[PDB]
Structure 1
Amino acid sequence: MDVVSLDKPFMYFEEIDNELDYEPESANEVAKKLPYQGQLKLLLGELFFLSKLQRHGILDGATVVYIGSAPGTHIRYLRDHFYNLGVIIKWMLIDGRHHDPILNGLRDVTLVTRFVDEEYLRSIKKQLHPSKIILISDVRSPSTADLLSNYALQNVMISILNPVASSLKWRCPFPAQWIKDFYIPHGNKMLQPFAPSYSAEMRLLSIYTGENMRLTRVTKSDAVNYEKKMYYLNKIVRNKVVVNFDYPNQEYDYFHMYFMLRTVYCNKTFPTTKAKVLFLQQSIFRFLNIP
C-alpha cells in the first residue's frame, strides 16, 4: 500500500512543490473510479468557491450566471444548500443543451437554452441590471485552438458581465501543442479532488475590486511547468493513503475533500469539524447516487 502522513493537502496550484516529466502512457490509464465523478468534482469546487463569497458577504443578493451549466444535476444540490441557509440568490443557467429536469419549477432558477456569444452577453447584462453578478463558467467546445477560443470567450464574459466574482474552467495547453501566448484573469488556482486521474484542469477563482481587471500572460514555459506540476500531483500525490487522517476513507482525494468541506456553513451545529464533514460528504454522495 502507498502510505504517508500529511499536515494538509495542496489546495492551490502554487503550493505544488515538485514535478515529474509527463508520461504519455498515462493517457491510457483508468480516468475515473466513481459514478457521476464529474458532477462530484464540480459540486465540491463550486461549494468551496460560493462558501468563500458568503464569508466575504458577497453572495447574498447576487445572481449567479452559470454558462455551460447542462446537465447541471449537481447544481440542484448547491441551490438547495444556500436556499436552506436563508441566503437569497437567483440562478440563471445557460447552455445550448438541456438541463436535468430536477432544476425545473424553482422560481429562483431560470434555465436558458442558448449558446452564448458576445452579443447575447450584452443583452443579458442589460436585463440583469442592476443586480450584482457572480460568474461560473464550465463551457467546453480539445485542440489548443479550441481552448484558446474558450478562454477568449471567458474573458469576454468577465468584461461584458462585469461580475463581483468568478470561477472559470482552466487547463493550460500542453507545450507540445503550443500555438501562441494568451492572457487569463488573475485569481487563485483551486485544485480539484475527484478530477479525472491525469487531468491538468483546475478552477480559476477571482474576486473583483474597484473597476480593475488584472490579467496574466501565459507562456509556453508556463505550459511546461503546468504539465510537470500537474503530472507530479496526479501520478504521485493523489495516489497516497494519508494514514494519519482518521476518516472512513484515507485516500488523498478524500483528505483534500475534507479540507474543502470544512469551510462550508451548516444550520445544524456539530461537536467536531469531522462530524460536519462526514455529514456533508454523506449528504453529497446520497444526492448524486454515489455509494
Structure 2
Amino acid sequence: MDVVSLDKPFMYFEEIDNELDYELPYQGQLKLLLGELFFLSKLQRHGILDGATVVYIGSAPGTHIRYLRDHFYNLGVIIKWMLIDGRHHDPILNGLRDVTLVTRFVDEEYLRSIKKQLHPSKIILISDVRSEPSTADLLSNYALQNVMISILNPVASSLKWRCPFPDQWIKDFYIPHGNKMLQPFAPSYSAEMRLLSIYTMRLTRVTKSDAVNYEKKMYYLNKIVRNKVVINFDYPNQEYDYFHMYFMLRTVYCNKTFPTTKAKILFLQQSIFRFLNIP
C-alpha cells in the first residue's frame, strides 16, 4: 500500500478531489454499525436523538443493531427502536423491551399506520432496504425511501444511496437533500454511501452525468485512496479504512473517561470488533 500523509480522511462524497476511469469477517455489519453510530452520534450532538424513536426499515438480520442500542442505552439516552423487515431478525435482538421487532414488508399503507401510532413522537429513519440489483430495482427502492420520508416525516434520516451506473441509466430521478456519508470497510469497489439528512424536504434531480461523476469519484476512492497507508497516523493500524473509522468514532460519546482521544477510539474499536467477532 503506497504511503501517504494525511490530516483527515474524506468524510463525505463532496470531499473527493480526484477521479479515475473505472475498470474481513462480517465486514458488512461493521460498515453499517460505524455509519449508524456516526449518524446517530451526530444527532446526539444536536440534542435531537433523545426522546426519539428510531424506525429502522430493512433491518434484518441486523446483528449490529444490538450494539447500537446497548451503546445508547448505557449512555442513558432514551430511545425506542422499531425494526421492520420481511425477513427475521438476528435472535440476538430478542428480549429487549425498548426494541420492537416487526416482521413485515413496508408499503405506503403500512407507513401511514406506523406514523399514526408513533405520532407526535420524533421519528428518526434508517433505511437499508434492497430488492445483483437492476436500475429499476434501485429506482423503486429510492422511490420507496422518498415515500418513507414524505409519510413518516422524520426529524432526520439515513438512507441507502448508490447511484445507478451510467451504462445502465433509465431516467432522471429525485432524492432528498443531505450529506452523502462515505462508508469505511465497504466492499472493495462499492460506490454506496449513506444520505444523511436533518430536516428543518426539498428533492434533488440526479442525472446521468451525476452517475458518471459518482462512478469515477468512487473508483478513485476505492482504487487509490483506500489502498494507502497513512504513515503519520498514530494508531496500531494505519490503513486508510482504519484512519477513516478513527475519525468517525471520535464523534461517539462514552460514559467512560480516557486519558487520550486515541485511547477512547482504541477502546471503542476493540468493543465493536469483539462484539462483531472480528480479530
1:182-238 superposed Cα distances (whole Å, 9 cap, x missing partner): 0000000000000000000000000011xxx11110000111000000000000000
The aligned counterpart of 1:193 is: 184
Structure 1 residue 6, shift from structure 2 partner: 0.7
**Deviation of 1:131 (Å):** 1.1
Which of 142, 148, 164 aligns to 1:151? It is: 142
Deviations 1:103-125 (A, max 9, x none): 11111000000000001000111
Structure 1 CA distance, aligned partners of 2:93 and 2:185? 24
1:128 to partner: Cα distance: 0.9
Q: CA RMSD, aligned part only?
A: 1.3
- In 1, the alpha carbon distance for the partners of 2:253 and 2:211 equals 36
Gaps of 5+ in 2: none
Helix, strand or coil at the partner of 1:169: strand
How far apart are the structure 1 equivalents of 2:120 and 2:20? 48
Q: Which runs of 5+ in 1 are unaligned?
A: 23-32
**1:137, distance to aligned residue in structure 2 (A):** 0.1
Q: State the TM-score, normalizing by the size of structure 1.
A: 0.95
Aligned-partner SS, 2:204: strand
Shift of 1:19: 0.3
Pick from 206, 213, 216: which aligns with 1:218? Answer: 206
Displacement after TM superposition at 1:129 (Å) = 1.5
Mapped partners of 1:15, 1:267: distance in 2 = 32
- Output the CA distance in 1 between the equivalents of 2:191 and 2:97: 37
Report runs of 4+ in structure 1 exceeding 2 Å deviation.
none
Report the number of matched residues.
278
CA distance in 2, matches of 1:248, 1:230: 26
How big is each residue's C-alpha offset from its partner over 1:154-209, in whole Å with a ceiling of 9 and x where there is no partner? Answer: 00000000100000000000000000000000000000000000000000000011
State how far apart, in whole Å, the 2-side matches of 1:130 and 1:215 are: 24
